[PDB]
Design a protein around this ligand. Sequence first.
Ligand SMILES: N[C@@H](Cc1ccc(OP(=O)(O)O)cc1)C(=O)O
Length: 108
Amino acid sequence: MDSIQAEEWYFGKITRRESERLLLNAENPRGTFLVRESETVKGAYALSVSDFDNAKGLNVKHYLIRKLDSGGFYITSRTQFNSLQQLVAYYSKHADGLSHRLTTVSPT
Ligand SMILES: N[C@@H](Cc1ccc(OP(=O)(O)O)cc1)C(=O)O
């Protein structure tokens, strides 16, 4: 499997604030996204996704991706993935509990 660093949507140690600055671009389709390290939960990841909310308008959603020491990743413990690549593919197809499905890799 490709290392996560080879994936166009993986931005590593980009901060939550830096991810919001990027994803709040009004040109980005709803569901523009990247994956990053979590700043608050060591060893976890975050899925950061451009959104349009009925009340808040343009906003960025952040979903915490937990990593099992035994192997695998999840946002909801009932729905586990063997890789971040599998997780991104799954949430690209359907929201299944996110605000919106993933549509667009954050441009850079
Ligand atoms: N519901 C939380 C879930 C969350 C928690 C932490 C997290 O990592 P970081 O602090 O790097 O954004 C990402 C998502 C949120 O909207 O922030």
